[PDB]
């Protein structure tokens, strides 16, 4: 047997071993987090081998190993797809998880439940691998709901805090809304195509109808937090910073884009769904970037940045470039995780302060953190030859060279400018200027765990784009012919955003005070979407669940019609029947009436 299948299966299998030891005498020892981190590093090293096999000969495989059950003509079995997407995404996720666990060994050092925290992180990684490698829709749904449950348990990690529980339930709600579309797609594909597995679905749907693809798009909008169902991702920063770095920035939130990438053969054929996907991505990537440029919490800024990048991935899918979207997923993971790590380092060195208004001049006080964050922002902005550049700059050209909605193109360019704007905001308000933090300085970044974990992702943020781009086979037709002004547009708009944001930020040094604009209020309060959509629908639903469903119907009218009416009628009849005074003069006269009636009513017609 060739080692490809064995190695791909063992990579995922060894990640479950530290979970089987969760009742052993290592889980009650302070060496458990290091044990988990070592297991993830070994898994990454093992997953590097099938990736080499694919880069060599393009080897791909599906493994149907366990037959779970058979319903009539439909067979459901545990099957894994080990195509380009799976074998390329697994090592990237393992690398990021290894860095983040090493980081969490330092960030969460004083937490009494750090062992539980490590097992929880590991549980999420297992569910994400199940989601990514799934070959049928049922196994995909298993991973889909597993990552959501792990996200719920990790957002509400500090369960004594009401806001964290509110955010975790908000995540569950917003994701169930898209779970509706996932289930719709499952039901449609099972009835119409008679299969849940990917191979059959591809065969039997040469020209896929609207409804399954619209269900898939709803599920993707829910998972990746697009404009309709966007607000849960920013609120998910209630969780500890490593949770934000792993789940809600680079790995879990790309599941919707991954779902639409897995079904790109069917989406190639439906123009309406591609248009809907492009428009949803465009409005998301603009709205979230617009909200980001006026935020003051650093985690909120990075969360809106990642939501805008997910919108950009959805735009790339909407113009029929699934491989470009997957490449951008892999690139974005590196520098977005490292940006969240740098933010966590700042927060820890400043006694758990997250507002940039209390971070002063850290450029020289935290030199390594400054270098890492500067390199990450440059990678995110599409600086030439960096990891970000090998995908994002190719996306902007692709939209420019396509039969595209004009408003979507304009929105994408404006969002590209706003990305540089909010990167400027972070750098300016966190690292430049004079200190604004309390006087008892605690700044210290000389922990080897922090330095090594950040440096490993720093090297990726620089070289991964060039390494990966030059080893993948060509999966598209390149745009070799452009007008010059259209080749340089991404850099031009990025530089324009840089200059405008820097000038508007330097304006804040002047000794003038004026009241804010209405546009600033709209941006800072997130388009008033949470202030309206988290108050009006919830209030009306919760008010009807009691006023009518419970009280008017269940407690009043359903009682009134069946049991209360019966009891009242029987009571009245009993009182009427039993209220005879006992005088024989009355009921012997009654007897006379009865006898007379019988003689004529029943006797006079025999």
């Amino acid at each position: 047997m060739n080692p490809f299948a064995s190695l791909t299966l063992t990579t995922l299998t060894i990640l479950t071993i530290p979970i089987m030891m969760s009742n052993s005498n290592i889980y009650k020892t302070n060496l458990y987090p290091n044990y988990v981190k070592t297991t993830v590093s070994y898994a990454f090293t093992l997953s590097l081998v099938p990736l080499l096999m694919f880069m060599h000969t393009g080897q791909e495989m599906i493994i149907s190993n366990w037959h779970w059950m058979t319903l009539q003509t439909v067979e459901l079995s545990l099957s894994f797809k080990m195509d380009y997407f799976s074998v390329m995404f697994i090592p990237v996720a393992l690398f990021v998880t290894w860095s983040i666990m090493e980081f969490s060994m330092w960030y969460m050092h004083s937490d009494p439940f750090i062992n539980r925290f490590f097992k929880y992180l590991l549980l999420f990684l297992i569910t994400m691998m199940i989601l990514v490698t799934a070959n049928n829709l049922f196994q995909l749904f298993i991973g889909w709901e597993g990552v959501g449950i792990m996200s719920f348990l990790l957002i509400g990690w500090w369960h004594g805090r009401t806001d964290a529980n509110t955010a975790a339930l908000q995540a569950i709600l917003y994701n169930r809304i898209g779970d509706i579309g996932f289930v719709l797609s499952m039901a449609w594909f099972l009835t119409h195509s008679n299969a849940w597995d990917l191979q059959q679905i591809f065969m039997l749907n040469n020209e896929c109808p609207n409804m399954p693809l619209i269900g898939l798009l709803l599920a993707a909008a829910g998972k990746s937090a697009q404009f309709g169902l966007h607000p849960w991702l920013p609120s998910a920063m209630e969780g500890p910073t490593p949770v934000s770095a792993l789940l809600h920035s680079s790995t879990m939130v790309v599941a919707g884009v991954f779902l639409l990438i897995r079904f790109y053969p069917l989406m190639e054929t439906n123009k309406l769904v591609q248009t809907m996907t492009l428009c949803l991505g465009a409005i998301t990537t603009l709205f979230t970037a617009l909200c980001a440029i006026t935020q003051n919490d650093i985690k909120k800024i990075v969360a809106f940045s990642t939501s805008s990048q997910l919108g950009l991935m959805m735009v790339t899918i909407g113009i029929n470039q699934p491989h470009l979207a997957f490449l951008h997923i892999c690139m974005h993971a590196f520098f977005k995780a490292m940006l969240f790590m740098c933010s966590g380092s700042i927060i820890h060195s400043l006694n758990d302060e997250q507002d940039i208004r209390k971070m002063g001049g850290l450029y020289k006080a935290m030199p390594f953190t400054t270098t890492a964050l500067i390199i990450g922002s440059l990678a995110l902005t599409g600086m030439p030859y960096l990891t970000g550049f090998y995908s994002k700059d190719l996306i902007i050209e692709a939209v420019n060279m396509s039969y595209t909605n004009a408003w979507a193109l304009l929105m994408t360019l404006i969002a590209t400018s706003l990305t540089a704007a909010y990167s400027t905001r972070i750098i300016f308000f966190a690292f430049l200027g004079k200190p604004r933090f309390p006087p008892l300085v605690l700044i210290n970044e000389n922990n080897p765990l922090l330095i090594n974990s950040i440096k490993r992702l720093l090297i990726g943020s620089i070289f991964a784009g060039f390494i990966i781009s030059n080893n993948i086979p060509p999966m598209t037709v390149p745009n070799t012919t452009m007008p010059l002004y259209m080749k340089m547009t991404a850099l031009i708009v990025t530089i324009m955003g840089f200059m405008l944001a820097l000038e508007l930020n330097n304006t804040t040094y002047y000794l003038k005070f004026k009241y804010p604009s209405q546009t600033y209020k709209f941006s800072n309060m997130l388009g008033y979407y949470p202030s309206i959509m988290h108050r009006l629908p919830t209030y009306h639903n919760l008010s009807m669940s009691q006023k009518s469903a419970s009280s008017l119907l269940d407690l009043i009218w359903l009682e009134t019609i069946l049991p209360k009416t019966t009891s009242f009628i029987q009571m009245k009849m009993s009182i009427m029947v039993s209220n005879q005074k006992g005088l024989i003069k009355l009921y012997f006269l009654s007897f006379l009436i009865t006898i007379m009636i019988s003689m004529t009513l029943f006797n006079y017609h025999e």
Partner: protein, 178 residues
């Protein structure tokens, strides 16, 4: 959160609270310390301009217009201290606060460790038991027949007395219990 509230806030309290709130929001708007110092001195001058007004109708009208000014001009995203009610670490450690009565349910093997701690706990429990009736007596004598007007509690006025209703204040879990 430690002092008992009063039936109402006086005019002086309201204007002081407005001053502090406006200064905090101004600091939220003016990120930099020199600019904040400049406009905070301007704010203090604006407050001092009517420091000794004796027309209570005029003072009330001025305070009301100041409130209307603040509500329009407030920062939509004011700075909050991390452990303050709106902050990012407000109730973060509440999951670690465990009441002390739980220690009564420890298995004797658990109590076999920490013998000194539990001897001290037994002394504390005996102290709490021995002074309860005196505290109840003190409360009944001191308070008015109708009932207590305010939530303020009296101190210990004799020698070997403890302040009434002290156990749960003293045996607070911690601010960083774990």
């Amino acid at each position: 959160a430690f002092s008992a509230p009063a039936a109402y806030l006086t005019h002086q309290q309201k204007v002081l609270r407005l001053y502090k709130r406006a200064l905090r929001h101004l600091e939220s708007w003016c990120v930099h310390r020199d600019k904040y110092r400049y406009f905070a001195c301007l704010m203090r001058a604006r407050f001092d301009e009517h420091k000794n007004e004796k027309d209570m109708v005029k003072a009330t009208q001025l305070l009301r217009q100041a409130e209307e000014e603040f509500w329009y001009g407030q920062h939509p995203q004011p700075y909050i201290f991390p452990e303050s009610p709106g902050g990012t670490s407000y109730e973060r450690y509440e999951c670690y606060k465990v009441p002390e009565w739980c220690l009564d349910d420890w298995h004797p093997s658990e109590k076999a460790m920490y013998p000194d701690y539990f001897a001290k706990r037994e002394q504390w429990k005996r102290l709490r038991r021995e002074s309860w009736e005196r505290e109840v007596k003190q409360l009944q004598e001191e308070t008015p027949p109708g009932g207590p007007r305010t939530e303020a509690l009296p101190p210990a006025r004799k020698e070997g007395d403890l302040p009434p209703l002290w156990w749960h204040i003293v045996t607070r879990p911690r601010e960083r219990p774990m």
